[PDB]
Amino acid sequence: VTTVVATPGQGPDRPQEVSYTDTKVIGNGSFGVVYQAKLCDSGELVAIKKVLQDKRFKNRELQIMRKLDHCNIVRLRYFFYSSKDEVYLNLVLDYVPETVYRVARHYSRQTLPVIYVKLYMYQLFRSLAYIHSFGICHRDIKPQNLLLDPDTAVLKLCDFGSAKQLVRGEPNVSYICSRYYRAPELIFGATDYTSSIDVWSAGCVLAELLLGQPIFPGDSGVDQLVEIIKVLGTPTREQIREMNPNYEFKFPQIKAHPWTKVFRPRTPPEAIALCSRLLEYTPTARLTPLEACAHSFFDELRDPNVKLPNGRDTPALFNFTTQELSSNPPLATILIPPHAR
Template sequence: MRLMDHQNVVSLRHCFFSTTSRDELFQRMPLVYVKLYTYQGTSIYSYCTRSLPQGCKASKSFDIWSAGCVLAELLLGQNQVDLLVEIIKVLGTPTREEIRCMNPNYTDFRFPQIKAHPWHKIFHKRMPPEAIDLASRLLQYLPSLRCSALAGAAPELINRLIPEHLRRQTGLGFSHPAGI
């Protein structure tokens, strides 16, 4: 954390551990903040994968999985203590191949056999379809199926999301298309 120097990264000064009660429920966050924090988080991820020395992040696809977990918790307004169990309730039981791709050390682990649950039934009825779509693309068992951060985004999207001075600073120097 001390190597980070990005407008969306908080500098690490001190850390400590704390515990909370199980099944803690949080107030649902307004969608505009969920969008903002998701953008900031993927922006940080994109910066980290471009700027830090090779080997500083555990895995690009793991970070995308983590972003999906955070997004789902923000959208649901609930902190999932037993997150893997909750994910299996939604995605269904991973196949042996999916387990091997996620972590080759756990191929013999036995998961309960659970069928996938439709994404639209997980969130409240007023949840925008694009939020559900993003969560479903981030939370894929197979790392190769997970979407990437802004590093792989279309130039038009990067132009709309990242201010021009930051595009120049980070080397994402695309020109503005007309009208944006």
Template sequence: MNMLKEKYTNFEAISNGIFKCKHYDQSLVIKIISIPTAEHRNGVPKEIIREVSLLKELDHTNVVRLVDVMSNKRDVFLVFECLDNTLHNFLINPAIFLYPTLIKEFLFQIVNAVAYIHSRKILHRDLRPENILIDFGTHAVKISDFGSARTFEVPFLYSNKVGCPFYRAPELLLGSSNYSTPNDIWSVGCIFGEMVLGQPLFRGGSDMELLNEIFTFLGTPTEETWPGVTSFRKILAQMGPRKEPKDMNRIFSELEPAGIDLLSLLFEILAVSLILNHMGTRKSKASIARWRMETQSKFIEFGLNLP
């Protein structure tokens, strides 16, 4: 800790190995995460090396900034800018009401961050309210925790046991390891719905329970809506009779029509991407362009004019 005290002051323990403090020369409030390395035979864990390298590639107002990296023989210290809250804290606090304009304000910043992350060829893979930092006073939003993030690779083969299951796309719950950016967008849709309802959309205790909740909500997929889904027929058979999608206007009765349309499109992108895998390149580009144009128009109708 001595090396840290040369640059930082006013240390306050947040939890085990995590401190809040200030830089001597600035008013910047920061958070320091201490990661023990002595117990690792090969030194710094590869997950930490990966997270640091990815964060050094990112520079966006809605992505948490890695201020510094320090180390000694026993620990690595990651120094981040510090925001005083998370979206999760907002959602579980009964004294805080997420009024519609605040939901729009948060969603705008979340989508901006995710679009930027994807433009840098990075998948976050663990988008959830706990990883969305918020400044209570200014309502500034920053995406954090890139420990599960990966750069795009072809083929897109990754672990499907990643992130919080509540925000995991059905493709991953079914066991697929071939996925890309639409799965982050699915998570954004889940977060958007949670901000409106005040609770997670899907809360099953297992992958099967979560799939059942998703299909009860959005309807059972078919080969037409989800090419290749019949390869999971044994799992789908356990879901019981075919389910029709629920009326989102009734579930999200307090959300304006443009918001409901936008939420539907955020969930639809997963199906769009799967359909594109079964189409020619020219058709694929045209279809995804149409989806983007429609989504952009719905953002505008919802009062969010994204760049």
């Protein structure tokens, strides 16, 4: 049994003794270590991210997660410090048994039923609308960071280790996101990008779930843009200017592949329409996450008599808060169905 003095993720700084056991290393990398463990008083499994923390400043990931409380974001239960002589921050997270990456991989070996594509994407856009309302850009949207509870079909966004509150005028690094999900303005080297890069990445996830494989499987930075161009066609000079004005060059003119021919023969037209409004070259032309939630692709989720394939009721889908609606409050006319009032 390991006992630490841990501070709850929510509320004021009120540290308390927390004991946990059965710690196993699940992942490793440059970020640090991710452990699985069990809380003794409750028996619940948790996940622990261990990163080295300097004592002279606050951990950016920690400060972001402490302001988040949302059904579709992984909860920070506790954080505590531990250890030659270095001090590590440990983030104690809720444990969700599955990720989107693993579930999609099974179908990549057939296609995920579209009811689940609606369910998972809807919750992802909800989580994006929530964090974007704080000015926070996740910057690592990809299937591996989408936790799933298969029993309840609840999705939870995690890994805020790349996240940042984007502030106008402060440039940011362009080499962000996993390659398959990187927005084209990032590939062009734009440093003044906005939270709309998350919407691009979310568009790639949606297309991947419809297609059964990543839509833009680039093998490198430039090749990633080539894969994008081979689907969307060559971006126009105006679209390039919106992404990065420093490209006055002339690129070969590749024709856009017909969107309805990109996906499977019976892909719902609403799904293809949503993809095209997310995977827009011009960053400001993409839907916001809240607009995405209100898209007609998710109308079936607002049906009072909607049936899930697991035989259970749908999770919380319409418990929007003022903070979540702040980018466009009148969208609640669509987002909250009459039976949810």
